[PDB]
Design a protein around this ligand. Structure first.
Ligand code: MG
Ligand code: MG
Ligand code: MG
Ligand code: MG
Ligand code: MG
Ligand code: MG
Lengths: 156, 80, 135, 199, 131
RNA sequence: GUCGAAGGUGGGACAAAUGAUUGGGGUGAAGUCGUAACAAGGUAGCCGUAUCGGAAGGUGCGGCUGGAUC
RNA sequence: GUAAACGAUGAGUGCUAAGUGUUAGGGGGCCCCUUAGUGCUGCAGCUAACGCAUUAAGCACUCCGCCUGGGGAGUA
RNA sequence: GUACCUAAUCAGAAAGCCACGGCUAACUACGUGCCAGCAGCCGCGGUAAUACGUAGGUGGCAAGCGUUAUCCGGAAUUAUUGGGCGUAAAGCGCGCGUAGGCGGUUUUUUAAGUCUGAUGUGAAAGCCCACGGCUCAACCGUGGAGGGUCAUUGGAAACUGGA
RNA sequence: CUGCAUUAGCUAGUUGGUAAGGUAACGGCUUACCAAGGCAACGAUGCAUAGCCGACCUGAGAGGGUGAUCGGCCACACUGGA
C-alpha cells in the first residue's frame, strides 16, 4: 500500500492559559489496483499523526471499478459542499485533476481521466466527494447481473 | 416558373379601402434557452374587391410593391 | 428561475471596472473632449513631488508625485527605487499598478524614461529601475 | 550547441546521466550549488513534473519553445501522446545520427549536422531539428568521410537500435521504422511531462 | 395542478425505490404503459400489470431488487419537460452512463430506447433517462 | 415662377462644463463629549411610526423573539 | 400604505416509515376505520450546521417574485 | 551578380533578462534596522531579514527577458449546459384578477413544432485532416472535411401544437 | 443582426384609395381630391453607441470578447447643396 499525506494542519484549542496546538494529518492509502481509502490522525507531532491516519485509511478501503486504467463511466461524487466531476478518458490522457482528487485517483490506480472540482476545495471534503464518486461507480458485468441480462444484450 | 412566397394568416383590420392587414403567426426559438416563443408579423396585402373581412383566415402571396407598405395580394379565403 | 422567467428577463453579467482609469482615457484638444483609448503608459508633468506616510501597520516616507497626464487627468504616481531626480514640472512616463500602502496612489513612474533617472547603484533587476548595465 | 552550460551540473540537478555514461553521477550524485551537499528537501508534484520535462528536454538538447512545439505536434498525432512525443524526439536528425553512432555525444552529433557533414538521401541537411521518417538514409559528406572525429566514433562499436540499420563501412544508416517505447530510454516518465503541459 | 404525468410516474418510481417498496399503483395512460413495458423489457422493474378499471385505469409496477437487496434502478431523470422540451436527432442521441443506462425516447416509430433509436436511425423527444 | 443649401430671427427641449455658498458621505491619525449596543451590557434588544434632546439616543403606541434568571 | 406586516419559509399538484394529543364531522363493532384542521415526538431523505421531516426545509412538475461581497445607500 | 554552390583562414567577432517566503522551479553570507525600501494577494523591514540593497550560488527562459495596458480563462462569481432564496444576499404584507406561461384520460384526423432522405446554396482565403514544394520549420500550393436558426421537394406520426 | 423604460406613446404624405405627373423600374416617389387611418409593451418613439461580414482571440464545450493585415459588401473624398 502506497500512502500520500494530503494536508497537515495545525489546529488550536483555547485554554485558560495560552493555547493547545495539535497536528492533524489527512492521508490517502492505495495499492494502485482499484483499492483506495482515506484517514485522519491527530497527534502532537506529524509522524505520529501520519501513522494514525495511515492506520485509519487502511482500516477503511473501497474498491474502484476500472476499465483499462480509467473509470467505467462519468460520475459526480458529492459530499457536503464538496463536488468532484470525473469523466473517463483515453490512454495517454493522464490524470487531469487537482488537489486531493489527484492523490485519491492515482492511489486507486487510475491513470487517464478528466475531472473538475466544482464545489468546496477543503481537502477533507474534496477527498470525501471523490470517494463518494468512486463508490457510486458501476461496472458492466455487475449492472448486467443486476438487470438480469448479458453485456451484449445490455449494449444491444 | 419560379413561384413566390405564400402565407396563411388571420385578418386583424380592414378599415383601409381595398387593403387588409394579415397577421401571420410564427414560433421563434430562444437562441440560448431553446424555448419556443410566439412571434406575430403583420402583413399589408392588397384586397381588390374588399372580399376579405376582419376575422377570416386568408391566404396571401408576395407581389411587386403595390403601395408604401403593401407587398402582398389576397389569393383566397380559406376559412371565415 | 424558470425557463420562461429567463426568456422574459435574460441573465445579466456583472460589469468590470478598470484598476487604472486614467490610462483608458485620451483627450482631443481640437474638439476639447475625452476619448476612450487604452494606453499602456501616458506622459505627464509632475504638479507636485514629495513624501507620504503609508497606512498602518506600515511606516515609511514613500516618495510620490502628483502628475497631470497628457489627457489632463491629475493622478498620484509612486516613484520606485532608491533616490529620484524629480521636481515640479518634470516630464515623466506613468504606467499602471497601485501601491497597496498608499491610499490614493494608483500608478507607478517608469524609471529611465523621459526625465526620471535610473536608480543609482542598482544591479539586480535593473530593467525594472532603468539602470544601464555597469560592465 | 545552443546550450553551452555545465552538462554535468545539469545531470546532477536532474538525477540522470544525460550523456549515458554515468560519469556525472558517479562521484557526486547530488545537486550543484552551495546547498548541493546536505540537500534533503522533498519536491512537490509540480517540481516532479518540471524535473521530468527538463530531463527529457536536456537529454535531447532542445530549447523550451521547440520542445513545446514538438509536444503539440506529437499530441496531434494519432496514438498515445507521451509515446508519440518520445518517438518524434527520437526521429530527429540529431538523435538518429547519435544512435547510428557517427558521433560519441549528442552535442557532437548536433555540431556535425549543423556544420553540414551529414546528408539525408544524398542531400545536405544543416538543421538538426530535421525530422527523419521511415525509409530514409543518412550518409556522410565525401569531403568529411575521413574526419578524425567521425572515424574515431565509428570505431567504438556502439549499440545500434532495432529501428536503425547501420553499415559502418559505408558510414550509411537507414531509418527502418518508427521507434518503440521500449527502444526509447526508460528513465523518462512521459506521463509526468504530459501532465506538466496540461498544467 | 398536475402538469407532467410522466414526471409524476418517474417520481413515484423513485420514491418507491428509495423506500424499497415492492409494488406501485399509479393512474394509467398509454405513454406511461409504454414506459413501464420498456422498463420491464430492459430489466429495471420486475413486472407490469394493467387494471382496466373505471375512470382512467391503473398501472401496477413491481420493482426489482438484486442480491444483497441492491436496487436495480439507480436513478430516473425527466429530460423533456412542459416548461422546456428537448428533442434529439439520430446522430445526437445521448448515451446514459456510457451505455450502461437507457434513455427513453418518443419517436414516430413508437416510444423506444436510445439503442433502438440509433439502430433505426431516428430521433424524437427524449422522455427520460433511467440508470 | 416652383423647389432649394447656407444664413437671419424666435420660443422651447436635451446634454456637458463652470459657480459665491451649501448638504450629507468616505478616509486620516493616540483629538473633544458622553457610553447607545454586545453579559440580565447594568432600563432586554430590535422593527414601523410620532415627538423630543449636544451626541450617541429617550419617551409614547403597536409588532417580533433573532430575549428572559427564579 | 408602512412593521421583526414572521412560520424571517410564494402559490398549485402528486408521491414518500411511524407514535401520540386536540377541534369539526362521518362509517363500522369502550374499541376500529376515515375526511379536514391544529400540536408534539420521530425514520428515509435533505442540510454548512442548527435543524426540517405527510402542516418538509424530502422526492418531483408548472407559474410567479426575488438574490449575486461589505460600505456609500434604500442615499442622490 | 541577389539567393544558392564550390575552394581557402580562424573558436577566433556573436549572452542577456527576470526570479529564488507560500502560490511557484530556485538559499547562503554581509549592510541596513518599522529607516532605507519591497509588494499580484497574504504581507515582509524596530539589530542573526531565504521577502529590503549588494555578493556567491541556484531556477526559468534565451536574442530575447521582464513591466504596463486590454480581452478570454481559471469564475458553477448571471449557473441552458451549470447556482440559489428558514437563520449566510434573496418569498412582494395579503387578496381579486388581465395578458402571457403551463395544463387530466381515450379515439379519428392534420403535419406547424419533431424526425429522416434528395437537390441548390453557405465565394476565395482562413481553422482542422491528408499530400506535395522551399535542406527543415514558419511559409506556400493541392485535395478533403467541416460551418445554416438557410431554401424547395418526398417520406414517418409517438410526443407538443390545430381540428 | 446593440444598450437604455430613471425613454410610453409616435405619426398628418402620415395609412389606404382615385387621377395625374415622374423614373430603367414598382411604389406617397411627388402633387391634387376622398376617407382616418398606420406603428407600438412581440418595445414603437426617443436617447447613446456602432461600418457589416468571411473571419480573429479565448474556452473541454456551451459560450464570452473582437472586427488590424488579406477578401466581399456598404459609405465617404475640406463642410453642405446641385
Ligand atoms: Mg449601556
Ligand atoms: Mg440597555
Ligand atoms: Mg423625554
Ligand atoms: Mg437574510
Ligand atoms: Mg409571506
Ligand atoms: Mg463611427
Amino acid at each position: 500500500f502506497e500512502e500520500r499525506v494530503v494536508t497537515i494542519n495545525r489546529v488550536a484549542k483555547v485554554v485558560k492559559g495560552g493555547r493547545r496546538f495539535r497536528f492533524t494529518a489527512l492521508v490517502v492509502v492505495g495499492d494502485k489496483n482499484g483499492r483506495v481509502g482515506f484517514g485522519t490522525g491527530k497527534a502532537q507531532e506529524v509522524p505520529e499523526a501520519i501513522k494514525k491516519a495511515v492506520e485509519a485509511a487502511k482500516k477503511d478501503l473501497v474498491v474502484v471499478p476500472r476499465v483499462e486504467g480509467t473509470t467505467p463511466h462519468t460520475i459526480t461524487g458529492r459530499y457536503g459542499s464538496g463536488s468532484v466531476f470525473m469523466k473517463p478518458a483515453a490512454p495517454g490522457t493522464g490524470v487531469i485533476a487537482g488537489g486531493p482528487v489527484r492523490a485519491v485517483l492515482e492511489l486507486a490506480g487510475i491513470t487517464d481521466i478528466l475531472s473538475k472540482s466544482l464545489g468546496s476545495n477543503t481537502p477533507i471534503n474534496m477527498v470525501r466527494a471523490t470517494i463518494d464518486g468512486l463508490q457510486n461507480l458501476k461496472n458492466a458485468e455487475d449492472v448486467a447481473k443486476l438487470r438480469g441480462k448479458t453485456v451484449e444484450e445490455l449494449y444491444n | 416558373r419560379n413561384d413566390r412566397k405564400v402565407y396563411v394568416g388571420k385578418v386583424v383590420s380592414d378599415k383601409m379601402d381595398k387593403t387588409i392587414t394579415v397577421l401571420v403567426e410564427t414560433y421563434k426559438t430562444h437562441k440560448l434557452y431553446g424555448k419556443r416563443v410566439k412571434y406575430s408579423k403583420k402583413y399589408k396585402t392588397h384586397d381588390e374587391n374588399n372580399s376579405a373581412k376582419l376575422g377570416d383566415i386568408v391566404k396571401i402571396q408576395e407581389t411587386r410593391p403595390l403601395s408604401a407598405t403593401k407587398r402582398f395580394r389576397l389569393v383566397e379565403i380559406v376559412e371565415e | 428561475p424558470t425557463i420562461n422567467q429567463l426568456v422574459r428577463k435574460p441573465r445579466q453579467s456583472k460589469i468590470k471596472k478598470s484598476d487604472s482609469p486614467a490610462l483608458n482615457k485620451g483627450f482631443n484638444s481640437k474638439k476639447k473632449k475625452f476619448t476612450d483609448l487604452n494606453s499602456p503608459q501616458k506622459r505627464g508633468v509632475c504638479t507636485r513631488v514629495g513624501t507620504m506616510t503609508p497606512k498602518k501597520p506600515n511606516s515609511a516616507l514613500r516618495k510620490y508625485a502628483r502628475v497631470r497626464l497628457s489627457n489632463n487627468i491629475e493622478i498620484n504616481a509612486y516613484i520606485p527605487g532608491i533616490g529620484h531626480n524629480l521636481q515640479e514640472h518634470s516630464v515623466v512616463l506613468v504606467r499602471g499598478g497601485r501601491v497597496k500602502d498608499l491610499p490614493g496612489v494608483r500608478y507607478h513612474i517608469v524609471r529611465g524614461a523621459l526625465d526620471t533617472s535610473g536608480v543609482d547603484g542598482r544591479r539586480q533587476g535593473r530593467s525594472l529601475y532603468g539602470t544601464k548595465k555597469p560592465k | 550547441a545552443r546550450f553551452r552550460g555545465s552538462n554535468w551540473k545539469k545531470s546532477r540537478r536532474l538525477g540522470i546521466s544525460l550523456s549515458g555514461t554515468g560519469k556525472e553521477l558517479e562521484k557526486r550524485p547530488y545537486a550543484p550549488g552551495q546547498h548541493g551537499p546536505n540537500q534533503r528537501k522533498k519536491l512537490s508534484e509540480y517540481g516532479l513534473q518540471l524535473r521530468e520535462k527538463q530531463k527529457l528536454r536536456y537529454l535531447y538538447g532542445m530549447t523550451e519553445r521547440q520542445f513545446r512545439n514538438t509536444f503539440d505536434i506529437a499530441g496531434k498525432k494519432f496514438g498515445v501522446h507521451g509515446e508519440n512525443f518520445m518517438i518524434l524526439l527520437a526521429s530527429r536528425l540529431d538523435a538518429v545520427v547519435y544512435s547510428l553512432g557517427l558521433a560519441r555525444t549528442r552535442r557532437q552529433a548536433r555540431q556535425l549536422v549543423n556544420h553540414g557533414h551529414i546528408l539525408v538521401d544524398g542531400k545536405r541537411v544543416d538543421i538538426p531539428s530535421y525530422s527523419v521518417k521511415p525509409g530514409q538514409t543518412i550518409s556522410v559528406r565525401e569531403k568529411s568521410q575521413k574526419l578524425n572525429i567521425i572515424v574515431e566514433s565509428v570505431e567504438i562499436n556502439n549499440f545500434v537500435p532495432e529501428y536503425l540499420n547501420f553499415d559502418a563501412d559505408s558510414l550509411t544508416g537507414t531509418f527502418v521504422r518508427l521507434p518503440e517505447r521500449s527502444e526509447l530510454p526508460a528513465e523518462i516518465n512521459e506521463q509526468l511531462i504530459v501532465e506538466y503541459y496540461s498544467r | 395542478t398536475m402538469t407532467d404525468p410522466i414526471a409524476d410516474m418517474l417520481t413515484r418510481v423513485r420514491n418507491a425505490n428509495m423506500v424499497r417498496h415492492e409494488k406501485l399503483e399509479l393512474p394509467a395512460s398509454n405513454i406511461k404503459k409504454e414506459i413501464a413495458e420498456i422498463l420491464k423489457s430492459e430489466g429495471f422493474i420486475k413486472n407490469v400489470e394493467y387494471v382496466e378499471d373505471d375512470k382512467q385505469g391503473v398501472l401496477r409496477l413491481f420493482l426489482k431488487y438484486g442480491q444483497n437487496d441492491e436496487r436495480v434502478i439507480t436513478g430516473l431523470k425527466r429530460i423533456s419537460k412542459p416548461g422546456l422540451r428537448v428533442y434529439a436527432k439520430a446522430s445526437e442521441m445521448p448515451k446514459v452512463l456510457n451505455g450502461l443506462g437507457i434513455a427513453l425516447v418518443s419517436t414516430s416509430e413508437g416510444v423506444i430506447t436510445d439503442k433502438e433509436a440509433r439502430k433505426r436511425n431516428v430521433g424524437g423527444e427524449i422522455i427520460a433517462y433511467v440508470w
